[PDB]
Amino acid sequence: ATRFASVYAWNRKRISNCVADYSVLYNSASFSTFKCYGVSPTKLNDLCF
Amino acid sequence: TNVYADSFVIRGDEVRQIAPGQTGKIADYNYKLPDDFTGCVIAWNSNNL
Amino acid sequence: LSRLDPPEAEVQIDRLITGRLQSLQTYVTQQLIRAAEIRASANLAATKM
Amino acid sequence: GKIQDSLSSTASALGKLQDVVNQNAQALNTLVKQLSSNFGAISSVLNDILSRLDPPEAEVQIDRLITGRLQSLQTYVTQQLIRAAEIRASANLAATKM
Numbered sequence: 137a138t139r140f141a142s143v144y145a146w147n148r149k150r151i152s153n154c155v156a157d158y159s160v161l162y163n164s165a166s167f168s169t170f171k172c173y174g175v176s177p178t179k180l181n182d183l184c185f
Numbered sequence: 186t187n188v189y190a191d192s193f194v195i196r197g198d199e200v201r202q203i204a205p206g207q208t209g210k211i212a213d214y215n216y217k218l219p220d221d222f223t224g225c226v227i228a229w230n231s232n233n234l
Numbered sequence: 235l236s237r238l239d240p241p242e243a244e245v246q247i248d249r250l251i252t253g254r255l256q257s258l259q260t261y262v263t264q265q266l267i268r269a270a271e272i273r274a275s276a277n278l279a280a281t282k283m
Numbered sequence: 284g285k286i287q288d289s290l291s292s293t294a295s296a297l298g299k300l301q302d303v304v305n306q307n308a309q310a311l312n313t314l315v316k317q318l319s320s321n322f323g324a325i326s327s328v329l330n331d332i333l334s335r336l337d338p339p340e341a342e343v344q345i346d347r348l349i350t351g352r353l354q355s356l357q358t359y360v361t362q363q364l365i366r367a368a369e370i371r372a373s374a375n376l377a378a379t380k381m
């Protein structure tokens with residue numbers, strides 16, 4: 137996104153009807169923080185959400 | 186016993202992917218520790234080397 | 235098993251395994267005590283016969 | 284005379300007394316064998332836990348083994364207690380027959 141909401145008034149986007157292929161992020165995104173709470177991250181590709 | 190030292194260079198935001206149970210371009214395609222890994226992981230910021 | 239990786243799943247599974255044995259041990263103990271009672275009845279029945 | 288020779292030749296009649304002995308021996312041997320169970324712990328051996336882990340981590344592993352060991356002992360006592368009720372009934376009958 138060009139712009140993000142401030143923490144004061146955070147945005148909430150609904151996601152539906154799509155494939156969660158997060159490997160598309162590997163070519164250029166970099167995340168210093170990442171943690172899953174309700175699922176082990178290695179299982180993200182075998183599940184529907 | 187059976188002591189081995191694996192050794193490599195990664196990006197700082199990728200250090201967190203070394204731990205067992207993680208996902209990401211390093212954990213999935215370059216270097217992965219087993220679920221029951223019994224050793225120690227050590228790392229440092231070689232930004233001048 | 236679907237949501238957790240092995241080392242995390244193992245904790246959850248071990249809690250269920252212990253609990254399931256607790257149910258089975260309770261069952262066996264109750265059957266065993268009842269068996270003592272039915273035997274006493276059978277011995278009396280044999281005596282009356 | 285026939286009883287004497289019968290007892291000398293075939294010991295199977297005495298199986299009831301042999302069974303009491305064997306059952307108690309097995310219960311005690313079972314308690315020793317169950318010591319090897321991990322019960323959710325990393326290792327069944329306290330020395331492995333204490334050598335590799337510091338106190339606060341070792342405490343978790345030890346507590347799992349302690350609970351498990353009591354479970355084995357409680358099982359043992361309950362079985363001995365039920366068997367004791369049965370042996371008492373036999374003893375009461377034996378006293379009556381005497």
Ligand SMILES: CCCCC/C=C/C/C=C/CCCCCCCC(=O)O
Nearest residue numbers: 156158162165166167180185209210
């Ligand atoms: C907006 C996507 C759809 C939402 C549904 C849930 C999807 C689960 C996926 C989450 C993203 C995981 C990315 C992990 C970081 C990889 C970075 C790298 O290795 O460099």
